[PDB]
Structure 1
């Protein structure tokens, strides 16, 4: 069935725990496969050692810029950017996993985990999975954000990979 992947997250060098994500490869195979491979590192690059660089309480936690660490970078397993696959899955509530972008058809590697229903992003961001385990970890990350998105602790994905 659908891949399960994990992110182990530190804040200021202290482990917060593990976020487990189910990737909806049955709905968005291309988007799911990109994220899966970026978690395993099997292409020679990916999320390990990168950060949650933008976190806004009562909104979302954003990560995946493993090249510039600031929201401008990232790349996919296909090339720098790739198309919006579909908008079938919606931003239904907390725990939704969705692609960050720079407008239409600019998916790379940046992603966010929602902490509320972000319905206004429907039809603009490709949803591709959700949190299976570790919403407590997500809430910790969230609490280290600010209105500006600047984080008050250094939030690092120390390890990541595929569980099944």
Structure 2
């Protein structure tokens, strides 16, 4: 069935808890597989030790730039970037997991978790999973953001991996 992955998150060195995510490999297999492999680190690089670098309250929490830590970097398991797989899943509400990008067909490793319904992103960002457990942790992360995206605390993915 669909993979379950986790992110364990710290804020200024203090554990916030675990976010568990279902990846919708049934609908977006290529996009799901990229995220899964980046969680396990099995290609020799991935999310462990990287940060949530842009967090905007009442909108989204963005992470996944493990090369430059500022929103300019990251890479996929396929190459630097890969195409938009499909736009079948929508940004239906809080807990949706979606690919960040720099325009059409520029997926890498950066992703975001929505904290509201972001319907204006439908057809522009590939949705590929959802939070199963840990929305409370996501809400804590959201509370440390600001309108500019700057975080008031350093938010680090201290561990991550695959549960099933």
Q: TM-score category by the smaller chain?
A: over 0.9
Unmatched tracts of structure 1, length 5 or more? none
Indicate the residue corresponding to 1:159 in structure 2: 159
Deviation sequence 1:3-50 (CA, Å, 0-9, x none): 000000000000000000000000000000000000000000000000
In the TM superposition, residue 142 of structure 1 has moved relative to its aligned partner by: 0.2
How does the TM-score come out when normalised to structure 1? 1.00
In the TM superposition, residue 98 of structure 1 has moved relative to its aligned partner by: 0.1
Indicate the residue corresponding to 2:94 in structure 1: 94
In the TM superposition, residue 138 of structure 1 has moved relative to its aligned partner by: 0.1
In the TM superposition, residue 115 of structure 1 has moved relative to its aligned partner by: 0.1
Please give the alpha-carbon distance, in whole angstroms, between the structure 2 residues aligned to 1:117 and 1:14. Answer: 29
Instruction: Give the paired residue count.
Output: 164
In the TM superposition, residue 147 of structure 1 has moved relative to its aligned partner by: 0.1
In the TM superposition, residue 151 of structure 1 has moved relative to its aligned partner by: 0.3
In the TM superposition, residue 127 of structure 1 has moved relative to its aligned partner by: 0.1
SS at match of 2:67: coil
Unmatched tracts of structure 2, length 5 or more? none
Please give the alpha-carbon distance, in whole angstroms, between the structure 1 residues aligned to 2:117 and 2:66. Answer: 26
Q: Which runs of 4+ in 1 moved over 4 A?
A: none
Indicate the residue corresponding to 2:85 in structure 1: 85
In the TM superposition, residue 67 of structure 1 has moved relative to its aligned partner by: 0.3
SS at match of 1:32: helix
Please give the alpha-carbon distance, in whole angstroms, between the structure 2 residues aligned to 1:85 and 1:156. Answer: 28
Please give the alpha-carbon distance, in whole angstroms, between the structure 1 residues aligned to 2:82 and 2:12. Answer: 33
In the TM superposition, residue 99 of structure 1 has moved relative to its aligned partner by: 0.1
Please give the alpha-carbon distance, in whole angstroms, between the structure 2 residues aligned to 1:80 and 1:152. Answer: 30
Please give the alpha-carbon distance, in whole angstroms, between the structure 2 residues aligned to 1:112 and 1:100. Answer: 6
Deviation sequence 1:41-82 (CA, Å, 0-9, x none): 000000000000000000000000000000000000000000
SS at match of 2:94: coil
